[PDB]
Amino acid sequence: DIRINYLFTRIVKLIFVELYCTHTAACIFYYLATTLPASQEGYTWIGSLKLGDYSYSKFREIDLWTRYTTSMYFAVVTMATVGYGDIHAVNMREMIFAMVYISFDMILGAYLIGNMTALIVKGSKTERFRDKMADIMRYMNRNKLGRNIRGQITGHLRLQYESSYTEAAVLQDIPVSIRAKIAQTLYLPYIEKVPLFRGCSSEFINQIVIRLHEEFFLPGEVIMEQGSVVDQLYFVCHGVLEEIEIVAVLQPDHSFGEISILCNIPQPYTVRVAELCRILRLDKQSFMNILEIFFHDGRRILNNLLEGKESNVRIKQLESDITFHISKQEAELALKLNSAAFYGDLYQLKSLIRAGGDPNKTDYDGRSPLHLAASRGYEDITLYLIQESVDVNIKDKLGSTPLLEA
Amino acid sequence: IVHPDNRWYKAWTMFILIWALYSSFFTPLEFGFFRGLPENLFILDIAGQIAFLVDIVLTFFVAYRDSRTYRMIYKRSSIALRYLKSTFIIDLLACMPWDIIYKAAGEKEEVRYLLLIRLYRVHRVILFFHKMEKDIRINYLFTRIVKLIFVELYCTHTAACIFYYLATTLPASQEGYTWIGSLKLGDYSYSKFREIDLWTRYTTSMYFAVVTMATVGYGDIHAVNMREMIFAMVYISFDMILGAYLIGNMTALIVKGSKTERFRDKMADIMRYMNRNKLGRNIRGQITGHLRLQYESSYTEAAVLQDIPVSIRAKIAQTLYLPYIEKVPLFRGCSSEFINQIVIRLHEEFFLPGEVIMEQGSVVDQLYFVCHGVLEEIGIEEIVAVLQPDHSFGEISILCNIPQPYTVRVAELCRILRLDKQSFMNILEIFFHDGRRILNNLLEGKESNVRIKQLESDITFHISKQEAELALKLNSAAFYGDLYQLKSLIRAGGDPNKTDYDGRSPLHLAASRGYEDITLYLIQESVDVNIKDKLGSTPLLEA
Amino acid sequence: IVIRLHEEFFLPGEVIMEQGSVVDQLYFVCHGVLEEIEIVAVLQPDHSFGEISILCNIPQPYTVRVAELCRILRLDKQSFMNILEIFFHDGRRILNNLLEGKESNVRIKQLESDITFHISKQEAELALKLNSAAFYGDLYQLKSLIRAGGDPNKTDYDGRSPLHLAASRGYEDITLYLIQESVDVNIKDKLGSTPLLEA
């Protein structure tokens, strides 16, 4: 069973076995005393016993208990290698059982130590915590870091130990790339609840979840400074973050840093943690790529920002930049489609066809994807457009035809 | 007024720790060796409770850190409500005086049994070891030994006081059955068993408990009664489990060792092999010195600095490496955020003087930045190139996919900042606007570079396809005649002197719709007025 | 060649190379006795075996058996067939020892004929691959065929100086070195052309 510990369930077994052996030895040891006739009971280990004023003269018909507790007390003393000397073997037969029991218990006694030190050799939670600070401390003071950053690191590391959990450090790293399935199990509910992703396609969300990360922040820390560009995207999952006198408070199921990740304007506000927060992060470079491929989905995302801008922070300069992209969004669908066929892309081309507009529509000058596909003779891609029943007599604004350049 | 962790409060906590130490060791003495309390010790009993009584009222005015939000609650009703449900039920009971009550309520042994409740307040001492255990400045082997010794020496002291109590339950008529009433060590009769002394009575009882705690068992003092055997088996059986725990706990810490002990073993093994063949006289010192530097500089690769969040990790990167990168000649003119990205992946490396970084003809798969010392390049052995600090090397080899043709060796203690080659194009590819600048810097720097480069590389091919893709939007923007986005597009590195796949240019499309408003901007942008497409169509003809 | 060696042991009674099997390694005996196979010969230390088959590509015609405990040095065919390919002058003299050794033991007329062809035309191939090196603009290993090679002025079979190919692709980073050797520029092939005309 995994609920109980591994070595602990083994330590108790050794203790019970060791305890049972003494009980059996004590019962047998009294039997060796009564194997002799009562006339010569004085040669036994109990027949000649005298502790205080009790004589043990008869050694029989005394009682069950005081006859037993005196035999077990002798056995338990021998087992623990104490050897008071109150009771000792007197007979030849009791001597032979004496070394047999003593020699065997020496192996068992040394076996209990070996099992239980292995329970300690496994790193304790505080044992690894001390060693981890020792490694970073020698690196951290070697470079002579400032005192302000000293509080941030040590306090953050203590959070991992104090709150435990954290799934160790590498988490195992043995799990296969099926971690995407686990990522969609926990991070999905917090993602769909954000206001910015309202109305976005589910598949687009299903792709952005697998690249998230889990981070914590202690109260009083500063994540983004004043007038500094940002390279990440943060979604608040738990806790309260405060933006800066104060301006606003960010309740959970909110995201910040989007004004500076789209319009390239440096972030004009400083955010500060007010309560312990579980915060999800994203990389700017990876997030920007998924918007380029999802041209139709990305355009609708800016609509929420424009609506959100009107409600709070109008941002006329940002609105003007956002308006230009949405206004010409319908044209760029076929504009990069021509470039897609020029380089013969296959896997991501279908995304702009299955989840895109008409490939028949040309660009500004007039250039069907069939024109560029046959320009370099990419026969591995030309066969697909006939499945879409694209016309062959595409008259561009040059007097040419898709067959002429082939 | 509420003081969460005031300096004055910490002094008070240590003061009450002394009282907790005193009252935890004195309670067994009063319970076992005494029947009541003599008038000589009345003042001590009263003073002991008053010291703890103040802690009961003073603990309602102390803030605590919330276990869920770490907010330092400070709420008046929250501090009180927390304490009444945690400890106040049992702590108040201990502070009650029981010597007076037992005397007042006639003389009954039943009430005096509950006096053992005061043994709980030894938990303050255990908590003190727990706090001191977490401190880095205190040796871990030392604190674990002290805590284990104290937790075992206290049990022995408690067992000694209980043992003498078991000998007092028997009436004085049959005192010869007890383990001590029949004692005779030398010529001391030990007959009376009472009104002998407090110290001679205690030191013989504790001498018995210590002897049996270490599994010695002299046998002069031993259990004789029936109620003393039962307690002897319990204490002995429980001791051997705790006794083996001290051995097991110290064994693990010795087995673990330290970094230096493991490092010593590694040098011991190699020295035996190196001395086995009796090879080298100066080589022996050279390899030994290199290994010493390896352990001394074994701190840049900090595995601890991996769970730290990237936002904190980024800040510590720019405070060390950034002042040494922004002034590199190769990285002149690049945008600020591009340098901020390459500074994250930089790695530290130390090199002992006299050794070689890379050899002639070996394909370069890592980019190196010079940060300290001096570097000497040797080729033939003649030295013609010297690498001064703040100068990069090996960049040309990676870009031109040519093996290094002129090896370099170090002459003085040099710190080299290493950048992985595999992690260099990927950042370069996503940043193509400034990627042209570093290529132009390379060409303008050297007199001829390497045949003015040769392209035919994934890095060089992709940057061309990305920049051409950018100009496609610029070409489309000029078609619609939206001058508002033209200035912004060219502001962020947009080059009007760019050609799309089909030979077209923004100047060509400017005359397509007769947009004279944007035509003069292109002239001010210094565009080729007679640029020809693949079909040889000049912009004038198109107009 | 030393820096690429490896040390391996072999207990007696083992077989290193079977009968009629191609060989991928070169073995030098350091200590011990090797038996070649009824028996044919015994290999005392300071000898090398597996050398006839590595060059002439003929499968190894003998079985090598470890008579007594031996520690031998090994090499790799891929990492050895190139070090003598770039050492054109040194590699040719190595075959001379084999030819002298072949006459003393194992004449190998078929192997001798193949070896004789390479040595006979070894002087011409010095400049033949020299032009190819200048064609691709090699720098580090090119000097080996100059510092430890023949005259770059000598042309190939058709007649083409390295200066001709140096200016063919405009490798200005390599053309400046030729003047240091005082190579002529009026070098004419059997076409009436000059290196300047090609540039």
Alpha carbon distance A373, B165 (integer Å): 103
- Contact predicate C24/C18, CB 8 Å: no
Cα B6–Cα B7–Cα B8 angle in degrees, nearest 5: 90
- Residue B453's SS3 state is coil
Residue labelled with tokens 């989007």 = A258
Report chain A's C-alpha Rg in angstroms: 40
b/e code B440-465 from CB counts within 10 Å (16+ = b): ebbeeeeeebbeeeeeeeebbeebee
Cβ–Cβ < 8 Å for B235, B223: no
Rounded to whole angstroms, the Cα distance separating C192 from C76 reads 47
CA distance C9 to C70: 6
The rounded distance, in Å, linking the Cα atoms of B425 and B398 is 10
Q: Please give the angle made by the CA atoms of B78, B84 and B86, to the nearest 5 degrees.
A: 100
Looking up tokens 């970073």, which residue turns up? A136
3-state secondary structure B251-311: HHHHHHCCHHHHHHHHHHHHHHHHHHCCCCCHHHHHHHHHHHHHHHCCCCCCCCCCCCCHH
Write out the H or E segment, with its range, that includes residue B164: helix B140-169
In this complex, the residue of A113, A133, A218 whose CB is nearest that of residue B244 is A113
**CA–CA dist B144, A111 (Å, integer):** 23
CA distance C166 to chain B (A): 11
Q: B interface mutation test: which of C86, C135, C139 has the most B CBs within 10 A?
A: C139
Task: Characterise B86 by phi-psi region: left (phi > 0), alpha (psi -120 to 50), beta (else).
Answer: alpha
Residues of B in contact with C139 (CB under 8 A): 402, 405
User: CB-based contacts of B128: which residues, under 8 Å, 6+ apart?
Assistant: B17
Question: Which 3 state secondary structure label does DSSP give B411?
Answer: coil
Which residue of chain B comes nearest to A70, CA vs CA? B229
CA distance A201 to chain B (A): 26
Closest CA to C15 of C37, C30, C32, C48: C37
Measured CA to CA, the distance from residue B95 to residue B89 in angstroms comes to: 11
DSSP B198: S
In sequence order, what are the beta bridge partners of B349? B416
- Partners of B449 on chain C (C-beta within 8 Å) are 173
Give the Cα separation of A133 and A126 in Å (integer). Answer: 11
Residue B403: list chain C partners with CB under 8 A.
Answer: 140
Closest residue to A81, CB basis, from B133, B215, B504: B215
Q: Chain B: residue nearest A138 by CA?
A: B299
**DSSP annotation string for A342-361:** HTT--TTTTHHHHTS--TTS
Q: What is the CA radius of gyration of chain B?
A: 42
Which chains form contacts with chain C, at 3 or more CB pairs under 8 Å? B
Instruction: List strands edge to edge, sheet with B375-379.
Output: B356-358, B408-410, B375-379, B382-387
> Using an 8 Å Cβ cutoff, are B538 and B503 in contact?
no
Asked whether residue B61 is marked as a ligand-binding residue, the answer is: no
Whether the CB-CB separation of C168 and C135 falls below 8 Å is answered with: yes
User: Which residues on B lie below 8 Å from A153 (Cβ)?
Assistant: 308, 312
Contacts of A136 in chain B (CB under 8 A): 302, 304-305
Annotated binding residues of C, written as ranges, equal 1-101
Whether A336 sits inside 8 A of B469 (CB atoms) is yes
- Measured distance CA(B399)–CA(B55) in Å, rounded: 73
**Contacts with B308 from chain A: Cβ below 8 Å:** 153, 156-157
Residue of A nearest to B462 (CA): A343
Assess contact for B438 and B396: CB atoms under 8 A.
no
B311 is in an annotated binding site: no
Alpha-carbon gap: A184 to the closest alpha carbon of chain B (Å): 22
B140, B299, B431, B486: best mutation site toward chain A, by most A Cβ within 10 Å? B299
Query: Taking CA atoms, what residue in B is nearest to C147?
Result: B380
Question: Which residue from B127, B259, B299, B131 is spatially nearest to A131, judged by alpha carbons?
Answer: B259
Chains touching B (3+ CB pairs < 8 Å): A, C
> Any binding-site annotation on B275?
no
Distance in angstroms (rounded) separating the CA atoms of residues B370 and B374 = 8
Beta strands at C25-31 and C34-36: parallel, antiparallel or unpaired? unpaired
Out of B71, B337, B509, whose CB is closest to A229?
B337
Chain C residues with CB under 8 Å of B447 CB are none
DSSP conformation letters of B20-87: HHHHHHHHHHHHHS-SS--GGGHHHHHHHHHHHHHHHHHGGG-----TTT------HHHHHHHHHTTT
C-beta separation of A281 from A213 below 8 A: yes
Question: Beta strands A254-256 and B347-351: pairing type?
Answer: unpaired
The distance of Cα A106 from the centroid of its chain, to the nearest Å, equals 45
Contacts of B450 in chain C (CB under 8 A): 173
In total, chain A counts a number of residues equal to 406
Contact B460, B453 (CB under 8 A): yes
What's chain C's Rg over C-alpha atoms? 22
Q: Using a CB-CB distance cutoff of 8 angstroms, which residues of chain C are in contact with residue B448? A: 172-173
Structure tokens at C37: 């196979």
- Contact between B405 and C140 using a beta-carbon 8 Å cutoff: yes
Q: What is the DSSP letter of B512?
A: T
Distance CA B204, CA B224 (A): 16
User: Residue C129, exposed/middle/buried by CB under 10 A (0-12, 13-18, 19+)?
Assistant: middle
Q: Which chains touch A (3 or more CB pairs under 8 A)?
A: B
Asked if B393 contacts B419 with a C-beta cutoff of 8 angstroms, the reply is no
Query: The tokens of B258 are what?
Result: 């330290």
**Are B448 and C173 in contact (CB < 8 Å)?**
yes
Nearest residue, CB atoms, C173 vs list B361, B406, B451: B451
Contact between chains at A80 and B232 (C-beta distance less than 8 A): no
Q: What's the DSSP call for residue B176? A: G
Residues of B in contact with C141 (CB under 8 A): 361
Cβ distance C173 to B405 less than 8 Å, yes or no, reads no
Q: Under a CB-based contact definition with an 8 Å cutoff, are residues B17 and B124 in contact?
A: yes
- Return d(Cα B523, Cα B127) in angstroms, integer: 80
Give the B:C interface size as CB pairs under 8 Å: 18
Cα nearest neighbour of C137 on chain B: B451
Residue B229 and residue B166: Cα distance in Å, rounded?
Answer: 11
Residue B360 near residue B382, CB atoms below 8 Å = no
Angle CA(B258)–CA(B259)–CA(B260) in degrees, nearest 5?
A: 95
Cβ contact A–B (≥3 pairs, < 8 Å)? yes
User: Which residues of B fall within a CB distance of 8 Å from A328?
Assistant: 476-477, 480, 482
Q: Which two tokens stand for residue B15?
A: 């003061």
Is there a contact between A84 and B219 if contact means CB atoms under 8 Å apart? yes
Q: What angle do CA A98, A100, A105 make, to 5 degrees?
A: 95
| Strand arrangement of the beta sheet that strand B347-351 belongs to | B347-351, B414-420, B366-370, B392-393
> Treating both helix axes as pointing N-terminal to C-terminal, what angle do A316-327 and B483-491 enclose, rounded to 10 degrees?
110
Chains A and C touch (3+ CB pairs under 8 A): no
Residue C76 has φ and ψ, to the nearest 5°, of -115, 140
Helical packing angle, A147-162 and B310-318, nearest 10°: 160
Interface test with B, best of C173, C174, C176 (most B CBs within 10 A): C173
C170 vs B contacts (CB less than 8 Å): 451
Nearest to B228 by CA among A69, C94, A335: A69
Helices and strands counted in chain B (H then E): 22, 8
Residue with tokens 């004043």: A226
How are the residues of chain B apportioned to helix, strand and coil, as percentages rounded to the nearest 5?
55, 5, 35
CA distance B137 to A386: 76
Distance from CA of C137 to the nearest CA of B (A): 9
Interacting residues of A134 by C-beta distance below 8 A, sequence separation 6+: B136
**CA atoms of C167 and B222, how far apart (whole Å):** 109
In the block, tokens 């499309």 appear at B509
**How many angstroms separate the CA of residue C145 from the nearest CA in chain B?**
13
Per DSSP, the residues of chain C read -GGG-EEEEE-TT-BSS-TTB---EEEEEEES-EEE----EEE-SSEEES-HHHHH-PPB-S-EEE-S-EEEEEEEHHHHTTHHHH-HHHHHHHHHHHHHHHHHS---HHHHHHHHHHHHTHHHHHHHHHHHHHHTT--TTTTHHHHTS--TTS--SS---HHHHHTTTT-HHHHHHHHHTT--S----TTS--HHHH-
| Residue at token pair 């009180």 | B80
Longest Cα separation, chain A:
136
Q: Which residues of B touch A127 (CB under 8 A)?
A: 140
Contact state of A86 with B245 under an 8 Å Cβ cutoff: no
Structure tokens at B317: 């990167």
| Secondary structure class of A226 (helix, strand, coil) | coil
Yes or no, beta carbons of A133 and B133 under 8 Å apart: no
Provide φ and ψ at C110, rounded to 5°.
-65, -45
Check A120 against B237: CB less than 8 A apart.
no
Nearest CA in chain B to A86: B219
Residues of B with CB under 8 A from a CB of C: 360-361, 402-403, 405-406, 448-451
Distances (CA, A) of C153 to A163, B328, C131, C179, C183: 79, 43, 11, 11, 6
- Tell which of B377, B407, B450 to mutate to test the C interface (max C CBs under 10 Å): B450
CB contact under 8 A, B223 and A120: no
**Can you say how many angstroms the Cα of residue C177 is from the centroid of all Cα atoms in its chain?**
27
Return the residue matching tokens 């005086």: B97
Other CB atoms closer than 10 Å to residue B180's CB: what's the count? Answer: 21
Give me B503's structure tokens. 């030979």
Q: Which residues of A are annotated as a binding site for a nucleoside 3',5'-cyclic phosphate?
A: 196-308
